[PDB]
């Protein structure tokens, strides 16, 4: 029935009276930035990242007189967590790329979309990483904090929404021992665009083809050493947000209380990650609280949020805006 897809004769689709369109307007690329902000350290185990974490304290005892008391033992469990590899080839029939000599120009225009597609996928998966369903992907930010019953359940802050139109904001601290990404022995992070050069292909019959091909490895995992350093602000009903911190859920307290949830921002470096839709209402809500106070005529626009609490507040698009409310 429906026929496709490696690279159907729509190189036509990218050209002028002439060669491949260089100034192409990059539409579906979004500026989410954990990938820039995230820390990368080689994972320590064979393809996992082990981490020993204290599970039980000795308590000590009040001891009644003349009575030799029990020794204590500090129980401590360790956790290992894995990586996943995300990689793809990018093939074109050499005959299709060669015409008008836009072989290189094509390879290039296609490439820009690949880099962007990988960042897109990597960041969408860093937040919604289900290793329990997809098996192949490394597990990300949900559902590590999902049910409010989970041991890190106190660290997810219920924004108090309900229904499907509701996001969450993230607050993390990237640093060696509280949260980072991990890459393998010895593959480097991140995104590697090796160009495979021309090589032969196979027609589905067996009937010979011949083409270019490009690889794009990018294999990361994710240590969440301790959930104490990550707090999620869930069920932010976005339809109900108003700039007057009025109906629905306020951002500024729901955001600072997330700041108070972190035991001392010491290392490495904190960051809020909010859907752009949130960032906008945030800007407006801030100026509105400050408006009943002291804001000048010229600072009427409101400086775009930069440092919320001296924590960079980073815009991340690859973060779902209609998330199911977290029961």
């Amino acid at each position: 029935s429906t026929t496709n897809p490696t690279l159907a004769d729509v190189a036509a689709r990218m050209t002028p009276d002439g060669k491949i369109d260089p100034q192409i307007v990059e539409m579906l690329n979004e500026t989410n930035e954990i990938l820039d902000d995230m820390t990368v350290i080689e994972a320590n185990g064979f393809t996992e990242h082990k981490t020993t974490v204290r599970s039980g304290l000795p308590t000590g005892t009040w001891r009644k007189l003349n009575y030799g008391v029990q020794p204590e033992k500090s129980r401590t469990v360790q956790v290992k967590d894995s990586m996943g590899m995300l990689e793809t080839y990018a093939e074109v029939d050499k005959a299709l790329a060669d015409l008008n000599g836009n072989s290189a120009a094509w390879r290039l225009s296609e490439d820009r979309a690949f880099i962007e597609g990988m960042n897109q996928t990597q960041a969408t998966t860093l937040f919604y990483g289900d290793s329990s369903i997809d098996a192949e992907k490394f597990m990300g930010l949900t559902p590590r904090f999902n049910s409010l019953s989970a041991e890190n359940g106190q660290n997810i802050i219920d924004a108090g929404g309900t229904g499907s139109d509701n996001a969450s904001i993230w607050l993390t601290v990237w640093g060696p021992n509280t949260l980072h990404t991990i890459y393998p022995k010895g593959s480097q992070a991140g995104l590697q665009s090796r160009d495979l050069g021309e090589d032969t292909l196979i027609d589905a019959a067996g009937g010979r083809y011949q083409g270019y091909r490009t690889h794009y490895k990018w294999d990361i995992g994710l240590t969440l050493r301790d959930w104490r350093y990550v707090v999620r602000i869930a069920n932010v009903d976005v339809s109900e947000l108003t700039k007057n911190a009025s109906a629905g859920a306020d951002l500024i307290d729901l955001m600072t209380q997330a700041v108070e949830l972190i035991p001392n921002v010491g290392m490495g470096r904190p960051a809020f990650y909010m859907p752009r839709k949130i960032r906008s209402f945030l800007r407006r809500q801030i100026t509105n609280k400050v408006a009943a106070s002291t804001l000048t005529m010229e600072e009427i626009a409101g400086k775009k949020v930069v440092a919320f609490d001296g924590i960079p507040c980073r815009r991340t698009d690859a973060l779902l805006l209609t998330e199911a409310r977290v029961v």
């Binding site: 029935s1 429906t2 026929t3 496709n4 897809p5 159907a8 004769d9 729509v10 036509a12 689709r13 027609d203």
Partner: protein, 140 residues
């Protein structure tokens, strides 16, 4: 006429009833909109001939859909007569400017049913179209 293995649809379908095409092209977007390409265009070739009880016509027409299920015509040719469909007659439909995902080619056959005739549809850039033009015509 160079051809995309994938843009080939209805390879040599022996269209006897007023039926739709065998294969449906699936573009990978809501709106391929390849008419804006100013280059793609459907071509339907004829072989061996639209032999039928007659007098019959085959209106070739392209159809869009949101999904591979319900189509609506977005361009058409008109009633091309029999004996205007000998083996070797391209009826070219320039590609509709506002395409959707899943395009197909329908063969609207006016009565009676065709008894013989295959039609080959594919999207190309571009058609091999070279009709001969007059010379003088005085000399001679």
């Amino acid at each position: 006429m160079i051809i995309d293995k994938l843009l080939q649809v209805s390879d040599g379908q022996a269209v006897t009833a007023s039926a739709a095409s065998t294969d449906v092209i699936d573009f990978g977007q809501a709106n391929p909109n390849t008419g804006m390409d100013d280059r793609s265009k459907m071509v339907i070739t004829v072989d061996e001939s639209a032999d039928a009880a007659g007098a019959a016509t085959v209106t070739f027409s392209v159809q869009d859909s949101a999904d591979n299920a319900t189509f609506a015509d977005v361009a058409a040719t008109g009633a091309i007569g029999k004996a205007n469909l000998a083996a070797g007659k391209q009826v070219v439909i320039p590609m509709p400017t506002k395409l959707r995902r899943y395009c197909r080619v329908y063969y609207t056959v006016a009565t009676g049913p065709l008894t013989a005739g295959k039609f080959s549809a594919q999207v190309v850039t571009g058609i091999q179209q070279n009709v001969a033009y007059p010379d003088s015509p005085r000399i001679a």
